[PDB]
Write an enzyme that holds these catalytic residues in place. Structure first.
Site, mmCIF file in Angstrom:
data_model
loop_
_atom_site.group_PDB
_atom_site.id
_atom_site.type_symbol
_atom_site.label_atom_id
_atom_site.label_comp_id
_atom_site.label_asym_id
_atom_site.label_seq_id
_atom_site.Cartn_x
_atom_site.Cartn_y
_atom_site.Cartn_z
ATOM 1 N N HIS A 43 12.311 58.201 37.062
ATOM 2 C CA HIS A 43 13.827 58.339 36.664
ATOM 3 C C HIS A 43 14.576 58.035 38.093
ATOM 4 O O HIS A 43 15.928 57.940 37.759
ATOM 5 C CB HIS A 43 14.089 59.464 35.755
ATOM 6 N N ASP A 87 6.534 59.964 34.130
ATOM 7 C CA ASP A 87 7.916 59.996 34.704
ATOM 8 C C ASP A 87 7.323 60.199 36.271
ATOM 9 O O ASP A 87 7.378 61.544 36.675
ATOM 10 C CB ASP A 87 8.791 60.938 34.416
ATOM 11 N N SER A 178 14.924 66.298 40.971
ATOM 12 C CA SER A 178 14.251 65.363 40.195
ATOM 13 C C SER A 178 13.426 64.831 41.360
ATOM 14 O O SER A 178 13.698 64.570 42.366
ATOM 15 C CB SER A 178 15.017 64.192 39.765
#
Ligand SMILES: *[C@@H]1O[C@H](CO)[C@@H](O[C@@H]2O[C@H](CO)[C@@H](O)[C@H](O)[C@H]2NC(C)=O)[C@H](O)[C@H]1NC(C)=O
Ligand SMILES: *[C@@H]1O[C@H](CO)[C@@H](O)[C@H](O)[C@H]1NC(C)=O
Length: 222
Positions: A43, A87, A178
């Site tokens: 992402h 991811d 992230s």
């Protein structure tokens, strides 16, 4: 539970600056697994990326920094923007980082195992995840528990085989950036993927064990 790291004590940590297609920059974390490869979340993909290795206070440029360009983003091919499965993404750097006290790799151990619920893990980062404003600009770390997958049943597509359920709601917002690594006993076992908009635990992390074959497939060909 929200603790400042001694500067440079996690020398594999990478701070990513991602140019988006439309111009603006966004940011994620990641980790140096080889001198010319950074591991992070899918992402975090964009037009092009630059990594900063050797940082502690990310808003204060210092001489330990090594800025390296990423030449190619290898986003996992089955990555899904709805379910958020798979991811994970590898970043090949233009040149190998120079090994210094402040900059080192975190290679995976040869042998690994599926990591079950119960153990405590740690995540360090700069808070670059989700929609909530960080937080702090220095590297900090929190301890988080691996939970039974039922604790993440509210996340529609959650799959125990693919993802870790992380953080006890009744004992713990910070979960790093992230793309940042979740470490269990010194080994990177997960990657920060997503959580609720309000950041109430648990959160979902990519289960690294599942992708070790794919990681090696990328490294082997590059
Ligand atoms: C991270 O580094 C920045 C830049 O040095 C710090 O922000 C400054 O704090 C100093 C304290 O000497 C003040 O005099 C400046 O007014 C601040 N400037 C900026 C850029 O905000 C920041 O405090 C550092 N964060 C730490 C140490 O946690
Ligand atoms: C995954 O994204 C695909 C796009 O390839 C979409 O068609 C699908 O609805 C998503 N997965 C499901 C079925 O939730």
């Amino acid at each position: 539970g929200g603790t400042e790291c001694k500067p440079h004590s996690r020398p594999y940590m990478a701070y990513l600056e991602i140019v988006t297609s439309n111009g603006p920059s966004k940011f994620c974390g990641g980790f140096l697994i080889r001198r010319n490869f950074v591991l992070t979340a899918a992402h975090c993909a964009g037009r092009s990326i630059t990594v900063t290795l050797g940082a502690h206070n990310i808003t204060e440029e210092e001489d330990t920094w090594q800025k390296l360009e990423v030449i190619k983003q290898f986003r996992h091919p089955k990555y899904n923007t709805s379910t958020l499965h798979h991811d994970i993404m590898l970043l090949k750097l233009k040149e190998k980082a120079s090994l210094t006290l402040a900059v080192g790799t975190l290679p995976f151990p040869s042998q690994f195992n599926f990591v079950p619920p119960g153990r405590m893990c740690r995540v360090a980062g700069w808070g670059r995840t989700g929609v909530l404003k960080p937080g702090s600009d220095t590297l900090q770390e929190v301890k988080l528990r691996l939970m039974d997958p039922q604790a993440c049943s509210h996340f529609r597509d959650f799959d125990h085989n693919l993802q870790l359920c992380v953080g006890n709601p009744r004992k713990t917002a910070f979960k790093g950036d992230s793309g940042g690594p979740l470490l269990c006993a010194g080994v990177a076992q997960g990657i920060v993927s997503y959580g609720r908009s309000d950041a109430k635990p648990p959160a979902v992390f990519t289960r690294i064990s599942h992708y070790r074959p794919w990681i090696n497939q990328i490294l082997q060909a590059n």
